[PDB]
Structures are given as structure tokens and as C-alpha cells.
Design a protein around this ligand. Structure first.
Ligand SMILES: *[C@@H]1O[C@H](CO)[C@@H](O[C@@H]2O[C@H](CO)[C@@H](O)[C@H](O)[C@H]2NC(C)=O)[C@H](O)[C@H]1NC(C)=O
Ligand SMILES: *[C@@H]1O[C@H](CO)[C@@H](O[C@@H]2O[C@H](CO)[C@@H](O)[C@H](O)[C@H]2NC(C)=O)[C@H](O)[C@H]1NC(C)=O
Ligand SMILES: *[C@@H]1O[C@H](CO)[C@@H](O)[C@H](O)[C@H]1NC(C)=O
Length: 153
């Protein structure tokens, strides 16, 4: 689904600094890539850093990424594979999560990506994400989780 982004969402500089786990997605991308960790460093209003992920073909790999920010959209570019490379629009930022939306070659009709401060986020964080989604015309029901990361005993 195309979202209805909110009207004057501030994307604060450095709001994306540090470690994130990309655990939830629409549509579900986790049968092709999994265990996704991102680490960003500020470079003025932009970021640069690293994405590590487990590839069914390659195992644990690392990639250099750049985020080039412009208002509320950014350009995601990865160094050695470009299937996720796109303009992404910020749908929500928060201390504990952020939500992007783009059309990379791997999902050219639209890909929403939820990144979390926590590997296995707790229910209060999840409830907020649910609320943030409904408020941009999306629904958490239609997202898939990275189930290869164990969040339950
Ligand atoms: C899932 O991702 C993590 C990174 O979060 C992998 O852990 C790293 O593994 C390398 C090689 O074992 C170590 O040198 C790093 O120290 C590890 N990082 C952390 C934060 O522990 C982990 O191996 C991945 N697991 C799978 C199954 O892909
Ligand atoms: C894309 O990104 C990663 C950067 O981390 C590169 O992986 C490194 O490759 C070098 C040799 O070229 C290894 O010595 C390092 O251990 C790797 N670093 C990490 C953090 O894993 C990879 O080479 C880059 N690929 C291209 C094609 O530019
Ligand atoms: C994703 O995981 C959360 C927390 O475990 C859960 O409540 C939610 O139902 C999951 N979504 C799907 C589609 O399984």
C-alpha cells in the first residue's frame, strides 16, 4: 500500500545515528535476507555506515551504505548490491523506531521498513508502531517479521 505521509514531519538531524535492527517489513522480505543490523554515523545532515545481514547464499555479509537526507526523503545507496537502493520517505521517527517507504528494485511497487532500537522490541514499542502505521494509512497486519531472530523461548 502507498502510505498517506503526514504533512510536516520533522526529520531531525542525527535522529538515525547508531544501531538499528530492521525487523519488520511490508511486503515480507525475510525469506531473501535476514538478521539485519544497521549502524549509522552522522556526516552533517547525512549518514554513512554499515548493514550486516545474513544472505541465504552468502551467509553473514557486511555492506557499506550511504544515507543522503533531504527534508523527509533520503537516498539509500549500498556499495556492492543495489537491489535496495532508492529514494525512501520517512513515515515516522521516534526514539525507539523509524519507518521508511521506497520503491527499490527488490520491491518496485513499494516497501515499508521498520527499524528498531531493540532487537526484539517490547509490546509498548510495538503498540506505538501500530499507531504510527494507522496514522499513515498502513496496517501492521500486512507486515512480516524477521522470524529467524529468536524473540521467544
Ligand atoms: C546476526 O547479526 C549479528 C550482528 O548483529 C552477528 O554477530 C556478529 O558476528 C560476528 C561474527 O560472528 C562477530 O565478529 C560480531 O562480534 C558479532 N556481533 C555481535 C553484536 O554480537 C550474528 O552472527 C548474526 N547471526 C546470524 C545467524 O546471522
Ligand atoms: C562493501 O562493503 C564492505 C565494507 O565493510 C567491504 O568489505 C570489506 O572487504 C575487505 C576487503 O576488500 C575486507 O578486508 C574487510 O574485512 C571487509 N570489511 C567488513 C566490515 O566486512 C566490501 O569490500 C565492499 N565491497 C565493494 C565491492 O566495494
Ligand atoms: C511480529 O511480532 C510481534 C511481536 O512478537 C507480534 O505481536 C506480531 O503479531 C508479529 N507480526 C506477524 C505478522 O506475525
Amino acid at each position: 500500500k502507498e502510505p498517506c505521509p503526514p504533512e510536516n514531519l520533522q526529520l531531525t538531524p542525527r535522529a538515525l545515528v547508531g544501531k538499528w535492527y530492521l525487523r519488520t517489513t511490508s511486503p515480507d522480505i525475510f525469506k531473501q535476507v535476514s538478521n539485519i543490523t544497521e549502524f549509522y554515523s552522522a556526516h552533517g545532515n547525512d549518514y554513512y555506515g554499515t548493514v550486516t545481514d545474513y544472505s541465504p547464499e552468502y551467509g553473514l555479509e557486511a555492506h557499506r551504505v550511504n544515507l543522503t537526507v533531504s527534508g523527509r526523503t533520503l537516498k539509500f545507496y549500498m556499495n556492492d548490491t543495489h537491489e535496495y537502493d532508492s529514494k525512501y520517505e520517512i513515515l515516522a521517527v521516534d526514539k525507539d523506531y523509524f519507518i521508511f517507504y521506497g520503491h527499490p528494485p527488490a520491491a518496485p511497487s513499494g516497501l515499508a521498513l521498520i527499524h528498531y532500537r531493540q532487537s526484539c522490541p517490547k509490546e509498548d514499542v510495538i503498540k506505538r508502531v501500530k499507531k504510527a502505521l494507522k496514522n499513515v494509512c498502513l496496517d501492521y497486519k500486512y507486515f512480516g517479521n524477521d522470524t529467524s531472530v529468536p524473540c521467544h523461548y
